[PDB]
Amino acid sequence: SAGKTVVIALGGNAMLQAKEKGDYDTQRKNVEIAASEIYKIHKAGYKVVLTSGNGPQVGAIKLQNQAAAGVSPEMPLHVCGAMSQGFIGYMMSQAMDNVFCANNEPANCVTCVTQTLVDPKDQAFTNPTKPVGRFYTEQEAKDLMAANPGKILREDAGRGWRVVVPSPRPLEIVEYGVIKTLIDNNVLVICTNGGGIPCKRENKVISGVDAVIDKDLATSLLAKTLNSDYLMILTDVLNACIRKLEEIKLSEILALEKDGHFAAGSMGPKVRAAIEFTQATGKMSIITSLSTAVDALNGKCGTRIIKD
Amino acid sequence: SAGKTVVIALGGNAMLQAKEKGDYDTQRKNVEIAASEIYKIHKAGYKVVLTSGNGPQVGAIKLQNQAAAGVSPEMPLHVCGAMSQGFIGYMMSQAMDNVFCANNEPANCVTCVTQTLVDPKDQAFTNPTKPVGRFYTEQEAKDLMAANPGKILREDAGRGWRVVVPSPRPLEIVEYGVIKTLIDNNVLVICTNGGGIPCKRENKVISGVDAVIDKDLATSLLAKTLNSDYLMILTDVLNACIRKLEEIKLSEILALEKDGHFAAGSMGPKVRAAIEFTQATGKMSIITSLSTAVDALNGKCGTRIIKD
Ligand SMILES: *SC(=S)N(CC)CC
Numbered sequence A, B: 001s002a003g004k005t006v007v008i009a010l011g012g013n014a015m016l017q018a019k020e021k022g023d024y025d026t027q028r029k030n031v032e033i034a035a036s037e038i039y040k041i042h043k044a045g046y047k048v049v050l051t052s053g054n055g056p057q058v059g060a061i062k063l064q065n066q067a068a069a070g071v072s073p074e075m076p077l078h079v080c081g082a083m084s085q086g087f088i089g090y091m092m093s094q095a096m097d098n099v100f101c102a103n104n105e106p107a108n109c110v111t112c113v114t115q116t117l118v119d120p121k122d123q124a125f126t127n128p129t130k131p132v133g134r135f136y137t138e139q140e141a142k143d144l145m146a147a148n149p150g151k152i153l154r155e156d157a158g159r160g161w162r163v164v165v166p167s168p169r170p171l172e173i174v175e176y177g178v179i180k181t182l183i184d185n186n187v188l189v190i191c192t193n194g195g196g197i198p199c200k201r202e203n204k205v206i207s208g209v210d211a212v213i214d215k216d217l218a219t220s221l222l223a224k225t226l227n228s229d230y231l232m233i234l235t236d237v238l239n240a241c242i243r244k245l246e247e248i249k250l251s252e253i254l255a256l257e258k259d260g261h262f263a264a265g266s267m268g269p270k271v272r273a274a275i276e277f278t279q280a281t282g283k284m285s286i287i288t289s290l291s292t293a294v295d296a297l298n299g300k301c302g303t304r305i306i307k308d
C-alpha cells in the first residue's frame, strides 16, 4: 500500500521449458515454479502487476480449432487469444493463491481478461512475424504450407519452423482503468496475458482483429500508463548480451540498439520495450531471468536500464 | 457509487438462441443484445455484477480437445472451463464496453477469471448430471458411448442427447474479495462464467477438479457472499410458472417447490437458487426474461421472490 509498483512480464519458460510438451500438468508445474519467484517480490513489499506471453498456448488453441472444424465451429485467432488468457490466467492465479496460502497470507489476486487496441492498418496484417504454437521440422513445415497456402511458417531461432501471425503495435490497454484501481487497492493483478486480445476501435466500437501482440511491447505500454516504478521482463537468460549489460544508461543502450547490436536473438523487442518505458517515465527497466528477479530489484544482477 | 447492487445471471439465450449453431458471430450478436438490456440497469444506476452459464461453450471446447487429441494435447474439463470463461468473458466485456461508449460513458468493466471450490466428495462426481455442448441423436450418442466407453450421454428437456459431467454444489468463490473490491469501486464486474472453474482445496493448495457447476447456485452464493441487494436470474422465459407467478412470498414459493411445481422442467435449480438467497439474506431474488430485466427491478413484472 506504500510499496512501489513493478510490472513483470513472464516469458515462455513460465510454462514451457526447452521443447517440453504443452500438456496441462507440465505447464502447471512450470507455473508453480514461477509463482514462487514472484511471491518473493510480493513479500519484499512491492505491488505486482503480472503479464506473460502467449506463443505456445494460443498456437495450440488455434491448432485445436483447425483440427476440429469438422466437428465444432472453428474460432478466430482473437477468440483463441481470449481462451489463452482464461487458461494462462487460470494457472497463474491458482499458483499465486497457493504460494500465498503456503505462507499463511490470504489469497488476494486476480486475472482480468484483457483487450488491447491496435491500428488495423498496421503493416503487420500483411506481414505475419510472430511465431506461435508447436515447432515443426524444416521439411515438416515445407509441406504443411504446400497443403494450406494460406499458412505462413518461418525458421525460429534455429529450433525449427513455426506458424506465424500478425503482430501489430499495441496502442491502448482497454482495461487500463480497472487495473489501476486493483493495484491502488493492493491486489496482485494478472493481466495482459499474451499481450491482450488484439482489437480495433472504429467509431466507438471495439472488435477483435486476428493477431498476437508482442507481450513485451504491450507490457511496456501498460507499465508506462500506470506510471509504474519498475518494468521487469523475465527471461531464461541471465543478462541481455550483445558482451553482457549490467547497470546501463538510456543513452548507451540506445546507441547499442540502433547499431543492430541486438538484431539477432529474441532480445530486440525486449530491449525496445525497456527503452520505451525508461524514456516515458524515467524509471528503471530490468531484463533478467525468472530465476534472478528479486536479485535484480535488489541491484545484485541483471540488465538494469536507467535514465541519463 | 450510491447504487444498490444487483447480481445478474445470464442464461443460454444470452449467447445461443434455439437451434443456432455456436460460431463466433452468432454468439457475439446474442451477447450484444443482452449487453443492451444490462446497460439499462447500469444507467438506472445499479451496481452490476454479471455472471452467466457455460454449457454450450465449455462443451464445445471439450469436444475440440477430444477431437484434436491426435494433434494437440487434450486439456482436462476444468482447464476447458477456464478457457470458456476467457471467451465468454471477453465477448461480454467487449459488448459492455461498446454499449457504454455508444452512450458516451467511458468504459468501466472487466471480466475476472473465477475459481469455485467444491466438495470433492459431492455425489455428483460418481453420478454425472449436467448436460453440455451440442444435441446428438439416440443414434449418434451410442456410437460415441462405445467408441468412447466412458463417455456419458443423456436426454435433456426432450430435444436430444448430450454429454454429461459432474455438477457439484459450490462452496466458495475464491476471487470473492477482489470482486467486492471491484463493485465497491463501481466497476461493472463480470465473473463466475458458467459457475467458475471447479476446484477443491486440501492442505491449503487449490487444484482443478473435472466438473461444471450450476451457474445459478454459484451466483446465488456469490450474491449471498457479496450481500447483494438483489439476485437476478435472467432467462428467455418471463416468469417462474407452474398459475402465473408475479410478486410472491418466500413462504409460498417454497411450498410450490415442495408440491413439486417446477421439478421436471428447467426451473428447479433457479428457484432453489433464489429461495436460498432471499432465505439467507431477506433480499429480493428476481426471475424474469432478459427482455424484462429493468421492468422487473422496476417492480412492474417478473417473478419477484420476497421474504415473509
Ligand atoms: S549473455 C550470454 S553470453 N549468454 C550465453 C552464455 C546468455 C545465454
Ligand SMILES: CCN(CC)C(=S)S
Pocket: B235, B236, B237, B238, B289, B290, B291
Ligand atoms: C418470451 C419471448 N421473448 C419476447 C417475446 C423473449 S424470450 S425475448
